[PDB]
Design a protein around this ligand. Structure first.
Ligand SMILES: Nc1ncc2cc(-c3ccccc3)c(N3CC=CC3)nc2n1
Ligand SMILES: [Cl-]
Length: 446
């Protein structure tokens, strides 16, 4: 087992990782910005290093500073969390180059999946169903581009290969807009990722966002841990996630999960990973792969019993997966509500000092947050300050537990989305289940 690790992150995920370390007897090094001295996990860590001032470029994205902290503390490994440098292949390469373990896949694997064109070709080759598309980069030849669009069928979508999070992608519904759409997406891709490579996909009008959790170790073991529905979103920001996905039969779960695990074996994947799919008309279509642990990982943990962060640390230490596939069983239902320090009318971050705090409790209630009474939410980072996860023996009990828990949650002094989450829980269509990726924006529009 790993002696000591640096937690190269902040807020809730850093505390999540810290708890996992402590359970395993792993010494913790909290690296933090000058704005993050009073973070709960920093306060609980065995060692702390201030790695720079508030802005992330000089703290949590500061590669030399994070590596130096691992060096000076005698840490053997670095957990990147999610966000920041977790999908940075150059960072992971530098970590291993410097002699430390990067808690994730190989840098080659990160780089493969961070290139959307190459990642798709690898999945399609491995037997994972993908969106009908160009199966290759789009050139500058617009006669070819119109032919590819005719072949696929309008509507189509133009996407940056080096991009993510819906940044720079446009729907095209006819030839007349195609040239201009390609050109703009390409220009925005060059400006944002220094990679002007773009591709084309059939545009799916009303899909659900359903993703498969995987774990792969260094002994050839690769398993799937069911799915998450993350369709309840706004402007490419998830709001509610749940596991398993409503409507998904064990037969579908088996079908797509086995194909994801098979893909892991083919690519020599290691650690925790997520295969993202658009799900429409009973069909799965691969869009992209995340090589990190994700925000919404706790709902998967509730329904399988598997502690995914502890699995990450074991894999990195050279231990095999602590469970086998036939030992993985979907039990019950879990719902996650993201808690954001945000303005209700603008949806912009709403930082400030929390004056009164109370966390909910009870059976099946899980609160994932660093916040406390007296804590100041800094303006420099993401608005998400906490995660409320509620489990029940079925979906309805999970929703009922969520409502009660949201009504016990007190966070005064700052603006939050607790009232919105309450609205979503009481939403008749959510309560029915199976609402598509566009539902929340349509509901908010009304
Ligand atoms: N070919 C498609 N069709 C629909 C899509 C909806 C997408 C979508 C829109 C809004 C919310 C979730 C997914 C989406 N992504 C945005 C982030 C990367 C995947 N990609 C699509 N590709
Ligand atoms: Cl994430």
């Amino acid at each position: 087992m790993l002696d000591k690790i640096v937690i190269a992150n902040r807020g809730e995920i850093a505390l999540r990782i810290l708890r996992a370390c402590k359970e395993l007897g792993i010494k913790t090094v909290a690296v933090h910005s000058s704005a993050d001295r009073d973070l709960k996990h920093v306060l609980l860590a065995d060692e702390t290093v201030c790695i720079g001032p508030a802005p992330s470029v000089k703290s949590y994205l500061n590669i030399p500073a994070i590596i130096s902290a691992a060096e000076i503390t005698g840490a053997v490994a670095i957990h990147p969390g999610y966000g920041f440098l977790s999908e940075n292949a150059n960072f992971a390469e530098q970590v291993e180059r410097s002699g430390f373990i990067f808690i994730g896949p190989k840098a080659e694997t990160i780089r493969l999946m961070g290139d959307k064109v190459s990642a798709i070709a690898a999945m399609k080759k491995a037997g994972v169903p993908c969106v009908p598309g160009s199966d290759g980069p789009l050139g500058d030849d617009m006669d070819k581009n119109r032919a590819i669009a005719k072949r696929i069928g309008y509507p189509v979508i133009i996407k940056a290969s080096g991009g993510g999070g819906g940044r720079g992608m446009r729907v095209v519904r006819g030839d007349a807009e195609l040239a201009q759409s390609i050109s703009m997406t390409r220009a925005e891709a060059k400006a944002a990722f220094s990679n002007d490579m773009v591709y084309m996909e059939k545009y799916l009008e009303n899909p659900r966002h359903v993703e498969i959790q995987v774990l792969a170790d260094g002994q050839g073991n690769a398993i799937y841990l069911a799915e998450r529905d993350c369709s309840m979103q706004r402007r490419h920001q998830k709001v509610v996630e749940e596991a398993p996905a409503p409507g998904i039969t064990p037969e579908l779960r088996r079908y797509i999960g086995e194909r994801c695990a098979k893909a892991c074996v083919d690519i020599g994947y290691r650690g925790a990973g997520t295969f993202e799919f658009l799900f429409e008309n009973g069909e799965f279509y691969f869009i992209e792969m995340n090589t990190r642990i994700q925000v919404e990982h706790p709902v998967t943990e509730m329904i399988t019993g598997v502690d995914l962060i502890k699995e990450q640390l074991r894999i990195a230490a050279g231990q095999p997966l602590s469970i086998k596939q036939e030992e993985v069983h979907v039990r019950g239902h879990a719902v996650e509500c993201r808690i954001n320090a945000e303005d209700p009318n603008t949806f912009l971050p709403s930082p400030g000092k929390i004056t009164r705090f109370h966390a909910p409790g009870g059976f099946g209630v899980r609160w994932e947050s660093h916040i406390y009474a007296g804590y100041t939410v800094p303006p420099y980072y993401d608005s998400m300050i906490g995660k409320l996860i509620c489990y029940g023996e079925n979906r309805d009990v999970a929703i009922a537990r969520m409502k009660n828990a949201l009504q016990e949650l007190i966070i005064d002094g700052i603006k939050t989305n607790v009232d919105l989450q309450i609205r979503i829980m009481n939403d008749e269509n959510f309560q029915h289940g199976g609402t598509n990726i566009h539902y929340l924006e349509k509901k908010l529009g009304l």
